[PDB]
């Protein structure tokens, strides 16, 4: 039996038979109270002590979400949709930590993705076991609201302030910082990592003061706060605000009771609502994000990145070789994970529609023309891979490429990745390469689990990621120094060298997507 002496109180974890070892788990720490009542969306308020052995052996509840249900009963969507019930009560942490117990571990910490409005610790790609039997790290994750629950900007009020699931997060950072030595961590070595909305949390925490002695090191999974989708604007937020108030009939004057208005609501109609409160949504539509709340994000954070205004720390950063192909199949015309997807110029100019619905004719015409100039015009894969392209260079690539390039021009070192790898148990099909969400399960080692159907040379490769992964949260320098692997340049604004992972050859490249990138981050913002 393992128990820990927590500031809050005892917790009780299990004991784990991984790779003919032991992981202890503490699952499903809470470290908040519970948003419940006046609570839901406040801050999250700090957790009074208890005095009974709080047993932390099973997940805890999600926070509440919408599910995923384009594709029932397909594991490419149903594996990130929640695995434990859904329920306001989610303020909890998990817990790995080497056995035996470590005495000064590097720690973890994992911050998922799912659009702001989705996601939880629990999935079975977080399973952080693996790290800790490896690598020897400590790995936390921890679940933080979403949605209007997480995201709902009344800015300056107090009652809706903004940026709570934000808050949720730095406040299970401070839980690692408090507690996380009475598991052998070291609270002086602290890796934030996270993949999607999860790395534009992790490069949001960079910005924010809240959180500079809560870390020491930063790894970026195909996000950045500078994403498109990443920042809801303090505009938009009050018309989402109003709009969600207006639909369930909460719409007062008195702003603060809306708030109480929407507080008596119960968490179905909220979740219901979400989707309306934009007039024209796409499938990155994140209704409900970070805002500039004047708390947590103190002024826009594209100013703040240019003017050097962050965490002066190593940063890790990279993202997939088509990031954009799973958001195809949510709603542009002539896609199907069931076939090919071969579409027309005229599908793909309609795909354009869906995916940049309040852009100009002619912004939706310099998209067109920059990834229609075909090198061979009669592919029939033409069309289909630019629109894929398109999503991604916009939405991930570019704003990931152009958050390394100006954190970099502050004299710290970055590495930048591109993962190039198709898991050959991906259940989506070939058309749609290397997707999005799916370096996850290659950084978390669930190809070392021999008896999981992956290669052999997929066990390599996570063997390899996770040593750089430990490597750069231990050390700040993701290389592999003993396997005489490729070694993993700095990535300076100058030559912007790069990355590689794949199974067969890991390289050395310069300048990811440049021509692309140039129209989407100096051109096209202007449209
Ligand atoms: C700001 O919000 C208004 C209102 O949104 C409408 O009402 C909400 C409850 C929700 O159901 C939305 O989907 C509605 O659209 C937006 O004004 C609407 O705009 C659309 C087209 O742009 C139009 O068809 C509706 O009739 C308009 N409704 C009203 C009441 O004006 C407005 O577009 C939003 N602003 C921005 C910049 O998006
Ligand atoms: C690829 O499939 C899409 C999706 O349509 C559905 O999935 C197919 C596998 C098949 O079961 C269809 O019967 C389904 O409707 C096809 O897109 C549809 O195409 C038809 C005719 O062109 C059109 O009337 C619908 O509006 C389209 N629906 C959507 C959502 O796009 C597409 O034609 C298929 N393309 C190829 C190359 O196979
Ligand atoms: C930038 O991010 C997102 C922003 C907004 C909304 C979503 C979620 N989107 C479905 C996800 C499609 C998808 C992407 C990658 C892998 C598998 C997938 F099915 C909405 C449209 C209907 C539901 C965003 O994606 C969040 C996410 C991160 C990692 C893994 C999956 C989803
Ligand atoms: C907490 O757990 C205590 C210990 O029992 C443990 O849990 C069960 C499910 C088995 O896994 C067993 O082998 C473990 O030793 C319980 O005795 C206690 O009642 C529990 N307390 C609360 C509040 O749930
Ligand atoms: C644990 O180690 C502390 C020093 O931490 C070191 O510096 C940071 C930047 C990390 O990168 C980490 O890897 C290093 O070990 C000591 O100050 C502390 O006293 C030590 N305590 C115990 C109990 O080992
Ligand atoms: C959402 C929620 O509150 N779930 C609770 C579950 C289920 O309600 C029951 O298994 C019946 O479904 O029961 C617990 O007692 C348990 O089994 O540990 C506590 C847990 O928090
Ligand atoms: C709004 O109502 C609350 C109810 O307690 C009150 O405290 C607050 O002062 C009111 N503000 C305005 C501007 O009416
Ligand atoms: C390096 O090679 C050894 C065998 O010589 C293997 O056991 C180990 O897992 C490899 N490590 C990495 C990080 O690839």
């Given at each position: 039996?393992?128990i820990?002496?927590?500031?809050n109180?005892?917790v ?29 969306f ?5 957790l009074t ?12 509840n ?5 599910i995923?249900?384009?594709?029932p ?19 909890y ?10 005495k ?9 993705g ?13 399973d952080?076991?693996f790290?800790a039997?490896v ?12 949605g ?10 107090p009652?809706?302030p903004g940026?709570?699931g934000?808050?949720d997060?730095?406040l299970?950072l ?17 890796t ?9 949390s992790v490069?949001?925490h960079?910005?924010?003061?809240g ?11 195909s ?9 809801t ?10 709009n ?7 719409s007062?004057?008195?702003?603060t ?10 968490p179905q ?9 934009v ?5 990155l ?23 050097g205004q ?5 940063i890790?950063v990279g ?7 799973a958001?195809?199949?949510?709603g ?24 940049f ?7 939706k015409?310099?998209?067109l023309?920059h990834?229609?100039?075909?090198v061979?015009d009669?592919?029939?894969?033409n069309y289909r ?11 991930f ?18 590495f ?48 390899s990621?996770?040593?750089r992964?430990a ?10 120094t003993?396997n ?7 990535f300076?604004?100058?030559?912007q ?7 067969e050859?890991t ?8 021509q ?12």
């Amino acid at each position: 039996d393992i128990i820990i002496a927590t500031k809050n109180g005892k917790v009780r974890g299990m004991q784990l038979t991984v790779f003919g070892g032991t992981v202890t788990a503490f699952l499903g720490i809470p470290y908040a109270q519970p948003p419940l009542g006046r609570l839901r969306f406040k801050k999250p308020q700090s957790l009074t002590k208890w005095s009974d052995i709080w047993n932390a052996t099973k997940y805890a509840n999600s926070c509440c979400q919408n599910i995923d249900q384009s594709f029932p009963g397909f594991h490419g969507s149903e594996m990130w949709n929640p695995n434990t019930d859904l329920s306001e009560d989610c303020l909890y942490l998990n817990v790995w930590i080497p056995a035996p117990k470590p005495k000064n571990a590097t720690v973890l910490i994992w911050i998922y993705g799912g659009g702001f409005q989705t996601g939880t610790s629990s999935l079975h790609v977080y399973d952080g076991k693996f790290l800790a039997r490896v690598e020897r790290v400590i790995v936390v994750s921890m679940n933080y609201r979403v949605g209007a629950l997480g995201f709902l900007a009344l800015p300056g009020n107090p009652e809706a302030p903004g940026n709570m699931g934000l808050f949720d997060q730095q406040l299970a950072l401070q839980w690692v910082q408090k507690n996380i030595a009475a598991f052998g961590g070291n609270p002086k070595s602290v890796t934030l990592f996270g993949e999607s909305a999860g790395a534009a949390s992790v490069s949001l925490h960079l910005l924010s003061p809240g959180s500079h002695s809560l870390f020491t090191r930063a790894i970026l999974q195909s996000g950045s706060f500078n994403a498109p989708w990443a920042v809801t604007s303090l505009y938009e937020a009050r018309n989402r605000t109003l709009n969600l108030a207006k639909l369930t009939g909460c719409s007062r004057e008195n702003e603060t009771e809306i708030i109480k208005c929407l507080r008596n609501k119960d968490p179905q109609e909220i979740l219901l609502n979400e989707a309306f409160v934009v007039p024209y949504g796409t499938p990155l539509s994140v209704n409900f994000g970070p805002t500039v709340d004047g708390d947590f994000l103190t002024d826009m954070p594209d100013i703040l990145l240019e003017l050097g205004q962050f965490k002066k720390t190593q940063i890790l950063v990279g993202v997939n070789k088509d990031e954009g192909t799973a958001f195809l199949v949510y709603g542009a015309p002539g896609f199907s994970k069931d076939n090919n997807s071969i579409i027309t110029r005229k599908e793909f100019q309609e795909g354009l529609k869906i995916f940049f619905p309040g852009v100009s004719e002619f912004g939706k015409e310099s998209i067109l023309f920059h990834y229609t100039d075909w090198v061979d015009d009669q592919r029939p894969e033409n069309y289909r891979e630019a629109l894929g392209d398109v999503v991604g260079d916009y939405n991930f690539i570019c704003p990931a490429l152009e958050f390394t390039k100006k954190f970099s021009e502050w004299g710290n070192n970055a590495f930048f990745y591109y993962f190039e790898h198709r898991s050959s148990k991906l259940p989506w099909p070939e058309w749609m390469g290397v997707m999005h969400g799916y370096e996850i399960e290659f950084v978390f080692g669930l190809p070392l689990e021999r008896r999981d159907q992956y290669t052999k040379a997929e066990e390599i490769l996570s063997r390899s990621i996770v040593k750089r992964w430990a490597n750069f949260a231990k050390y700040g320098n993701p290389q592999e120094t003993q396997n005489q692997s490729t070694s993993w340049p700095v990535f300076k604004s100058t030559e912007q060298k790069y990355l590689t992972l794949n199974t067969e050859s890991t390289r050395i490249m310069t300048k990811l997507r440049a021509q692309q990138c140039r129209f989407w981050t100096s051109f096209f913002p202007k449209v």
